Design a binder for this molecule. Structure first.
Ligand SMILES: [Zn+2]
Lengths: 150, 185, 129, 87, 81
RNA sequence: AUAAACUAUGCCGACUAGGGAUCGGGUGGUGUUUUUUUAAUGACCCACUCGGCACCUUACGAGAAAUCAAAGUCUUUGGGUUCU
């Protein structure tokens, strides 16, 4: 189930049985690349480039029409973020709870829910240091947490 | 001569026969001068189909299989009429690197595209070229032999519908694995 | 989480022999499950099985023909010296004269009988009868 | 089952269920031996010439006895278009 | 029951199953070609789109996101391709 | 940081049986109703599905029994792991 709750939901995307673009697509394998980097220069994460491309430009998913994953295109173009967006959105949520809990510290549930979020930050930053995505120590600090999100 | 610039260095007489079949369309040239000029191939193997026909396998260097796929359907028509009793198919000359044993070491880690189980999958994707494969099943019989089953897309199937008997012979000669093709509706 | 897919597959088969079914569907599938089913097939314990190709891991549908009492897994895969095999066949086989213990030797996955005539040994996977 | 000289032992060989291929024990009193008449032109069921099916008491308790005979008799030509493989 | 064709289930049963519980999982969504009244250009829209998709020209509205399929707005002809 | 802190039933994973209700989300209907003439939503009906709190009937199975769809898949004894 979920890591930090008892929910057992299975809701998920379902990739089709095809490693080729659909026959109706016929834009290019390269004009999509320019449209990938056009959104990235607007400061868009890979998660929200894909939802933007699928909803409007009709790409099913960017691997089957290019061969590359989206942030491999960004990293090849030099638009990779400093920290992953997977870890960035966990830190931003931790700063949001810390700011909230700073002024009304009678929430025993926001103190509980903060611990779950910070534990998830440490588990994920442990993985990133191992695969050399993050610098070898990098030491997520709460006092400097708000600096990284902005 | 532009006939000899397609084959490797010398061989062979059969490579010239297909070479003349290209220049009769390059010199006719409704639109083909813009796309059939750079397209070149490497070799022909002749495979005896279990019927009265035979099969022609065209091997492509594969920076250019995408280029060949533009004129694939049209060019096969102008190869089957001037070569009777034949079935023409286009394949890519892929490289298979051997699996490293605990003694047979190497340098340069072997990419997954060079594995044999991935090359044989790319043969089935390239034998049939239209009618994208919509599934695969493998039967492990009681006796002990394995029979694959390739499920093909129902649309545009009338371009290869007669060639299912030929394809099972070609894939057997290159892989040694049985194939049945089934068309779901 | 899923710790071993071989245990799930053999649990699925064993539950459907008890209920009376003539087929199972197991998911996922691996080379170990394929070889274990191939050893079961050549001794006549199961019928034909078909491997459905997903792009993920695949599923298997296995036809059952009665005549199977138990297929089980041994976890952990204990190391078995060549003189310890008759200590396992005595433990978890119903008689000395039918039934097989499937091992994993460097000569491949095989039952205990022709691990003996090949004179190899290794780790234990399970048993069928 | 036999000895070295091929002489038979095991005082009786048991019946086996024709649906689930399992042994009919000597104390399975819910087991059933179905006898079906063989027929020829103009009806007239031939006496004493049968098509026989055995069902174990496990199957009948589970409620699978009807669906089993529909399969067991359609494959013998006794029925047509009653049992379907694909559910 | 106790004998089934698990390799060839009927199309009705596979249609009434969940998206992941079929024999091979796959998407039940699709893509749509919609004609806004303003211009005549080709716009491809995901059926379960999450962004409020607008045309490249005059950018009004083409669909509104919902918790299910996107609600296509007032009359714009749609194809399914 | 103590409770009959209780479901006196650790947590994760898989399989095995039939049903009718209900909570939240979703899909479908040449359905009902609300009025503008139906429309758009909303409420409702029918069918399906995912995820929940539960319940009813049986017992292939388990148990010392009471009873239990898990307390089953256990002398045919081995899915992973913590505590007692
Ligand atoms: Zn517009």
């Amino acid at each position: 189930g979920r890591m930090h709750s008892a929910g057992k939901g299975i809701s998920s995307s379902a990739i089709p049985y095809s490693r080729n673009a659909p026959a109706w697509f016929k834009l290019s394998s390269e004009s999509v690349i320019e449209q990938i980097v056009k959104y990235a220069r607007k400061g868009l994460t890979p998660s929200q480039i894909g939802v933007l491309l699928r909803d409007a430009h009709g790409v099913t998913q960017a691997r089957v029409i290019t061969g590359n994953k989206i942030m491999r295109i960004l990293k090849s173009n030099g638009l990779a973020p400093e920290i992953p967006e997977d870890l960035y959105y966990l830190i931003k949520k931790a700063v949001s709870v810390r700011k909230h809990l700073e002024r009304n510290r009678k929430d025993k549930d926001a103190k509980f829910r903060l611990i779950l979020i910070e534990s998830r930050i440490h588990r994920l930053a442990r993985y990133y240091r191992t695969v050399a995505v993050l610098p070898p120590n990098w030491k997520y600090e709460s006092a400097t947490a708000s600096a990284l999100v902005n | 001569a532009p006939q000899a610039k397609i084959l490797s260095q010398a061989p062979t007489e059969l490579e010239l026969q297909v070479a003349q079949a290209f220049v009769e369309l390059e010199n006719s040239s409704p639109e083909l001068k813009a796309e059939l000029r750079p397209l070149q191939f490497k070799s022909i193997r002749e495979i005896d189909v279990a019927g009265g026909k035979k099969a022609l396998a065209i091997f492509v260097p594969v920076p250019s299989l995408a280029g060949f796929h533009k004129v694939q359907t049209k060019l096969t028509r102008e190869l089957e009429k001037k070569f009777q009793d034949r079935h023409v198919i286009f394949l890519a000359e892929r490289r298979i690197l051997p699996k490293p044993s605990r003694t047979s070491r190497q340098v340069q880690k072997r990419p997954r595209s060079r594995t044999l189980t991935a090359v044989h999958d790319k043969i089935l994707e390239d034998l049939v070229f239209p009618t994208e494969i919509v599934g695969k099943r493998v039967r492990y019989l009681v006796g002990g032999n394995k029979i694959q089953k390739v499920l093909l897309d129902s649309k545009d199937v009338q371009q290869i519908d007669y060639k299912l008997e030929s394809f099972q012979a070609v894939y057997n000669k290159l892989t040694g694995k049985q194939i049945v093709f089934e068309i779901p509706s | 989480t899923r710790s071993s897919v071989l245990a799930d597959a053999l649990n699925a088969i064993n539950n459907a022999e008890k209920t009376g079914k003539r087929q199972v569907l197991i998911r996922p599938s691996s080379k170990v499950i394929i070889k274990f089913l191939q050893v079961m097939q050549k001794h006549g314990y199961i019928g034909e099985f078909e491997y459905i190709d997903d792009h993920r891991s695949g599923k298997i549908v296995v036809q059952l023909n009665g005549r199977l009492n138990k297929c089980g897994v041994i976890s952990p895969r204990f190391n078995v010296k060549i003189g310890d095999i008759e200590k396992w066949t005595a433990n978890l086989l119903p008689a000395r004269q039918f039934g097989y213990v499937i091992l994993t030797t460097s000569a491949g996955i095989m039952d205990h009988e022709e691990a003996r005539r090949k004179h190899v040994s290794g780790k234990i996977l399970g048993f069928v009868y | 089952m036999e000895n070295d000289k091929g002489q038979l032992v095991e005082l009786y060989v048991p019946r086996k269920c024709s649906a689930t291929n399992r042994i009919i024990k000597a104390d399975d009193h819910a087991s059933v031996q179905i006898n079906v008449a063989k027929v020829d032109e103009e009806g007239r069921a031939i006496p004493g010439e049968y098509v026989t099916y055995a069902l174990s008491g496990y199957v009948r308790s589970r409620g699978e006895s009807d669906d089993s005979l529909n399969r067991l008799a359609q494959n013998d030509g006794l029925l047509k278009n009653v049992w379907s493989y694909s559910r | 029951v106790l004998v089934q064709d698990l390799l060839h289930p009927t199309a009705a049963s596979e249609a009434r199953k969940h998206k992941l519980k079929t024999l091979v999982q796959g998407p039940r969504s699709y893509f749509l070609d919609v004609k806004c009244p303003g211009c005549l250009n080709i716009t491809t829209v995901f059926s379960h789109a999450q962004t409020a998709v607008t045309c490249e020209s005059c950018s009004t509205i083409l669909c509104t996101p919902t918790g299910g399929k996107a609600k296509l707005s007032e009359g714009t002809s749609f194809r399914r391709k």
